[PDB]
Subunit: 150 residues, 6 copies
């Protein structure tokens, strides 16, 4: 039952978060209407969420770990892009009269971005260690029974 | 119970995702206000979601696999269109003074689009193999009982 | 329990879908600000969803089949209208400078609209046949018991 | 359990429907920026939903029929107003150059509005009769036991 | 179980209602861009919802009645403000050419506002009486057992 | 079961609240298009929510207290920023013709901000005391059994 709820909660959140970000980012682009980066960022950001949303639909009818990677990787990737998107927006909006303030947006972007990716590495690192930790402990216990077995 | 939740979760997500995309895409069009493609893409994109939403309503009161195809196919088709829609938007917004940056939008579109369709093929391919895999295994087990039966 | 969930899921989806479409369509109209059709379509579309939403509220406290017709009919009717609405929007937005592209919107509208209504007819047709199918089978079984009864 | 779900489903739908309508109607007003009616309609519409939303909050901690009236009456009243609001919007947007089309909006409004209120009367009328129907049937059964009792 | 659901339903509704109102009110302000009141009302309204949202987050990990007051008071306070906000918006939008219609907005505001606060007083008054009612009934029953006890 | 629901409810609310605020704040910035503060505030605000949303995704597959800190701290931090964001918006919008009224926005901001942070301190302070309160009571009870044990 715990596993069923995990997918259920993940399905709604992923769709809700991915859909809104795509729509708002899209509208944000039309309102204003580095130069090349803005176009590429918006397109890539939307595509990532779309592919992820598809995963929610394909999994419904239904290797499991492989597909899981796509959902986690895409959702995470999209979030980072959204962060990159807003930074560009400020640069684009202020780009006309506000160029002076525009720089602060990207400069302050680096700090949070680094911590964002760095924090993920630490969490993952600890997880990997646990996998190995259990492996050593598991075989150890079996040997205990095996030894006494003889 | 597992089957009931599958439809329940799919119903909300499909409606939430399809509805928002339709509304935002619609508004995105009015804000700005290849040339012909923009009009066709928007209309087709919305229609796909609408038909899908209807499926959610018709199934509520209630061959099952046939209807399922419409929901999965439409939702997937709409997502691809939304991706095509945003690419056109950038081309439309920048189309005036920004034509130079405009190309990057469509050029970067090809990459994601290919993977989008290609990935679906792989997932489906594996599924088809499983159907056959079970067929061979099933008849095999029955023969086992049949042979011993004699 | 299966019946309770059916209404519960239907209540949320109907409200979420009907509300958003009404709001977006409303805003889409103010942004731009055949000519007569645009005004009539928007008003009628919103009214349908409103009446439907009311059904969700009235049923909460609580012939059952009769009211059900209003919910299914209204929701379905509204969806078709939303499709008609977007087609008009393209015609309205492009109508000024965009006439070249405007036509494609309505022309491509016909295809999806036809299939939309046509598909509903097929599904309903199969359902009606089932109702008659059961009737024949039901009386048949009773006769079996009736004959042996004598 | 059936009663608990009734309130739970009603709480979410009421809040979701009332909140969105209030926000969109509010934004619709700022975009454009009979004359007096537009101002009064918008303010009254929002107030109705707000009071209703409060009901959802006040009932959470917790005569029951009395409060129920406020929720049903307010939600229903607000829906009717929203319908009146959109009609005014078309009249306001087109009011400048579009007056010819503006009339169709209000004219087509009367039809749906009438049926909207008229339909409610029929449903309520049937309900009232049922209450009396049970009253007569109930006393009748008791008399049956009373007569045989002697 | 009844208590758990009460908080669960309250958590989602509060967040959904508070978040949307804050966002729309914020956008409504940028679109148009008494004079001083408009600025103060918007800031205060948003702050109230934010603090409330925090309550939802802080309570998750977890005197209970004290915190409850903040949620109910803030949510209720915010709703009243939202009502005050829309009235100001009409006054602001029409303030230019529409001053004549502007007055009707605030004038019609008084009626609903009065009933809003007044209705709350009646509901609370009845609740207080019940608390005392039970107190008298409780001691009475105990005395009954106490008397017969001797 | 109580613990499972806690995370489930927290997951949806966090995503819904964080996503909407990010989108609206983003759009609010494009509509208008201290000077430097506006750019920094918007970028930082969005980044906080994004990192938080990631937490919802990473925890799904799965020290527990450590990660919990990120979710609570980020969500809370973002809310405060949103409050700071709106204050800047008023200052930015009125900044042109409205400078006079602009001050009232920030001045009235201080009051709510102080109470916002101050209130959290009191709640946390009481919690800490309880932790120590239980510690003293716990050891005390064990001694009772320990003494009688001898």
């Amino acid at each position: 039952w715990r596993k069923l709820q995990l997918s259920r909660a993940k399905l709604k959140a992923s769709s809700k978060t991915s859909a809104l970000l795509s729509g708002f980012a899209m509208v944000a682009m039309v309102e204003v209407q580095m130069l090349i980066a803005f176009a590429i960022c918006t397109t890539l950001l939307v595509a990532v969420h779309m592919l992820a949303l598809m995963i929610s639909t394909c999994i419904l009818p239904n290797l499991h770990w492989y597909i899981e990677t796509a959902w986690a990787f895409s959702t995470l990737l999209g979030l980072i892009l959204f962060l990159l998107e807003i930074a560009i927006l400020c640069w684009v909006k202020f780009y006309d009269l506000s160029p002076p303030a525009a720089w602060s947006a990207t400069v302050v972007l680096i700090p949070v971005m680094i911590i964002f990716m760095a924090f993920a590495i630490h969490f993952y690192r600890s997880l990997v260690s646990h996998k190995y930790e259990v492996t050593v402990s598991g075989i150890r216990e079996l040997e205990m029974l095996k030894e006494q077995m003889e």
